Amino acid sequence: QPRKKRPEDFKFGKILGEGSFSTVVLARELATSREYAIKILEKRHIIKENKVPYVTRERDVMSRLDHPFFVKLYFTFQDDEKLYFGLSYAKNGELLKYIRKIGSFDETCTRFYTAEIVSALEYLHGKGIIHRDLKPENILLNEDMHIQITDFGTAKVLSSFVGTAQYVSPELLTEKSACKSSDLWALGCIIYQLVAGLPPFRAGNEYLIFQKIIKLEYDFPEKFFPKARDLVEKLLVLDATKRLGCEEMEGYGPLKAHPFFESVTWENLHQQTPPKL
Ligand SMILES: O=C1NCCc2ccccc21
Known part of the structure; x- marks a missing residue:
């Protein structure tokens, strides 16, 4: 060394x-x-x-x-x-910076960046690691405009903490427990935010946000890409064992096979040129 x-x-x-x-x-x-x-x-x-x-x-x-x-x-x-x-x-x-800069992403950019996150989560979850605080503030962008996920102080290594209010999963509010599926809930909030320009659950204070989360209280704007909408509905699910991508739903294969991702080539995302924002 x-x-x-x-x-x-x-x-x-x-x-x-x-x-x-x-x-x-x-x-x-x-x-x-x-x-x-x-x-x-x-x-x-x-x-x-x-x-x-x-x-x-x-x-x-x-x-x-x-x-x-x-x-x-x-x-x-x-x-x-x-x-x-x-x-x-x-x-x-930060990814958040671009969300605010251009307001919301078109379908091509939503798809490309959602795929990178999914692909990153697949890698992370395969090592038995949960992020627990995934959000556009922690998803950075390199010079080449590919993502770089950060902020692991609050990560949990599988085999005690609550993240950022707007991305907190229901199970954290009702059990104090976190699992890989908690990151998939965060992914659903992020995809919604890329498309809509804002996080799904919004209110005047944390208490009221937590209230909306556990009641699954949100809705989609009229223009929301239909396949992305279906995907988000399959991720923002109160029962953590029923979110697309979790082990009980047979893992990342079915998540990656979602129609929203039809045109995505999963094997070499990092070799692809990101769509201009
Ligand atoms: O560029 C960065 N790499 C490491 C993580 C980080 C945190 C806050 C601001 C910039 C960075």
Whole structure:
């Protein structure tokens, strides 16, 4: 292994994001001229907030990921005060940014980007990992406009936490429990959001949002692509064992065979050129 890196190896630049117990800063490695997104965490603060398990899980999950649709962990190091995670830099920022920029996606772009997420979730779920906080804020875009999923501090490794209100699955509200199917619920909310321009469940506060979620209280705009609508109806299902893509429904095959995805070639999405937004 190369010698441990250290802060003085980098020219630090702008802050890219100010996460839960961390700050992500753009950094250029002097020796190589490579750009990394370095996640910086203060040890004392992590210890004080009882987040050692949190940070340990984050690093352990990220070390296991080796797929182009996920953030990559290249290196770690620490000094007296801080932990540093050297992560891939997603040049084009958040999916959410593009949703707001152009309002909503046409069918071709919805299909292409939904497929990348599904394909990413298939990989993740095959390793026994649940994300638990999947959302357009955490789905980044690379320079090449392919997705790069991030934010694994709150992930669960199969064999205690509630995500972002608008994407929380009903089972989390009624049991405290999460499963792979919880990510598929999030996927349904995201597809709806790509097409409609807004998340399905919206209200004045978390309480009222949680209320709508458990009553499955939402509806589709008039223009909603019919096959995407059918797909979302098969994902936004209160019973977690009946969502398209979960094990009880025989996995990712039937999800990927959905009519909405008819024209998708699943084997080499990362080699395809994304539709212009
Ligand atoms: O580009 C990024 N890569 C790592 C994850 C991240 C978080 C917040 C802002 C940017 C990034």
